[PDB]
Write a protein that binds this ligand. Structure first.
Ligand SMILES: [Mg+2]
Ligand SMILES: [Mg+2]
Ligand SMILES: [Mg+2]
Ligand SMILES: [Mg+2]
Lengths: 338, 348
């Protein structure tokens, strides 16, 4: 009675980027490192998720990395998109890249692992947006305009604790064009990493539900990466969605990276998000393979232990199902049509 | 009396790559230069064609082809890391052309789509890659480009790749200029067959051609190449290569480049119709009436003064008719032979 989980964000693709020669083993067998691979997804009741294409750069605060332009980002983003299509070839029907809400739901029914092509940081898209149309043809259905790094579209938050997400300038003209064009193409915009001014611009300009695929409650942990109550109110009004990030740095009240922590911070964030957003607007946004996560979860096979903790906390079965997958599926329908 | 033409190869996207700030005018209005633009296409009876994504290398070359014997050196190899941004730029302009034209141009992914454009008078475009530099030896990007609409690929231009080797521009000379396909090239042929991406042998050298003839399960195609027996350019096809194409039920598109039409292999646009008609006769004779069409190389070559740009297609058709091609043969040469080839390569 593990409930299948659909997840808001993972960086498994980055592992294939860094060791392409070993891709067969890492994806199909596992290489005994990291949080994810196909057998462990199955063992832990991972139903699918958004798979990020993320172009990497070469009290605390990390400096912002330099901007990467489309010429340098494009080959890396193509490499990662190429690995995601390869995963589907190699898994011979047990994994499917989905481009519609109906496809996600059919995978769920069929026990086929679903994947949504997601871009975290829009460096591979030029200010002209021509590449946005190309990526959309390839299957891209979700885009975070920024990572924690300046782009031609706007600005992401630096990693800092404690601090407000109001960390810099809002969207550029090109970023405002990017919102309008993702709305028209029905590409879900992802606000995670975006700074508060950029968030405000999206809230003002987008005609679609506001989404943060992997961010927690700033009221609970004041990381610059978490969402204030004001931002949560805006997400709620838009009938949007927030995916809970399993990064220890965004869960612990002290904002420390340490994995030595119990279920209380996880439940504290989940309670706060559910309380403010509503039961229909919260899900999982693990950041599997992109963060250090609680020792209690450890990797994707830790999802059943997380559910057991949520159950013990008193979340009823209908709410467990919404939190594990149903809320994401309804969000996809509200964002893309269904 | 102009028959709509479906064409084997043009390099219009290169004009857009070179001047992307002016693309709205270049495409929708014309900028008074070049061979193609949307109004002139309509004027000339251009039904559609393959639009090449071609990654250029870095006046001298044009001067060397003005007076043969000549041989241009091969440029250096370009790797996927460098080629990919350029091929994405061009692929991106092609999708833009369709957005901008608001229904008067359509990028087609199936033979049925191409035919439906023809019936509706909508200009059709097939996404074509000329030289496979933007594809790594691993082929992962082949799958990516196919998803976005790529349906045709020449593994090489006239430049070495990880897949094999193109011919140097030379006159006179054999197309047997270098080595055949690499192991990666053999895998590339197998995967284009599985994905049903049409292979284009134009620019490929003789050993590479032979490899594809042996390995491909699909009709052999050269989108823009003429008869070596008439003009012995390294870029043209020998009678042996023509017989191989004929046997596979393939296709050859006539290149309008003066260099590949004139008996003397010169670049000058100052020429009549007789060489055009000589090549067409020879092709038709050896390939059959079903296996020949146009492959202009519009915006990619110097072409005869009598054609000059896409508005000259009607003049070419009049010369063909005056040469005694009847109407059913005209319709085969102008478009029906390509549509048939697409059905044999991709499925009907
Ligand atoms: Mg990530
Ligand atoms: Mg992230
Ligand atoms: Mg060309
Ligand atoms: Mg060419």
């Amino acid at each position: 009675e593990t409930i299948p989980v659909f997840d808001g964000h993972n960086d498994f693709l980055l592992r294939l980027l860094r060791n392409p020669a070993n891709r067969e083993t890492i994806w199909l067998k596992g290489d005994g490192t990291g949080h994810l691979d196909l057998p462990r997804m199955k063992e832990g009741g991972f139903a699918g998720g958004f798979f990020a294409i993320y172009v990497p750069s070469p009290p605390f605060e990390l400096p912002l990395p330099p901007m990467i332009r489309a010429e340098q980002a494009q080959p890396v983003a193509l490499a990662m998109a190429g690995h995601l299509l390869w995963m589907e070839r190699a898994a011979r029907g047990r994994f499917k890249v989905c481009r519609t809400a109906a496809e996600v739901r059919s995978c769920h029914a069929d026990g086929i692992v679903s994947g949504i092509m997601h871009m975290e940081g829009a460096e591979a898209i030029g200010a002209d947006l021509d590449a946005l149309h190309l990526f959309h043809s390839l299957g891209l259905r979700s885009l975070g305009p920024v990572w924690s790094r300046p782009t031609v579209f706007g600005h992401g938050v630096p990693f800092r604790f404690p601090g407000s997400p109001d960390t810099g300038e809002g969207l550029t003209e090109a970023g405002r064009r990017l919102v309008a064009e993702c709305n028209r193409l029905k590409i879900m915009l992802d606000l995670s990493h975006l700074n508060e001014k950029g968030f405000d611009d999206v809230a003002r300009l987008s005609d679609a539900p506001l989404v943060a695929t992997h961010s927690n409650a700033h009221a609970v942990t004041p990381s610059t990466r978490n969402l204030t109550d004001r931002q949560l109110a805006m997400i709620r009004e838009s009938r949007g969605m927030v995916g809970l990030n399993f990064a220890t740095s965004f869960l612990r009240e002290d904002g420390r990276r340490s994995a030595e922590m119990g279920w209380e911070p996880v439940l504290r964030h989940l309670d706060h998000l559910i309380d403010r957003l509503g039961e229909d607007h919260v899900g999982m946004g693990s950041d599997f393979d992109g963060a250090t996560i609680p020792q209690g979860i450890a990797d994707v096979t830790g999802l059943p232990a997380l559910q057991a903790a949520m159950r013990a906390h008193g979340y009823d079965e209908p709410l467990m199902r919404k939190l594990c997958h149903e809320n994401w599926y309804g969000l996809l329908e509200r964002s893309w049509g269904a």
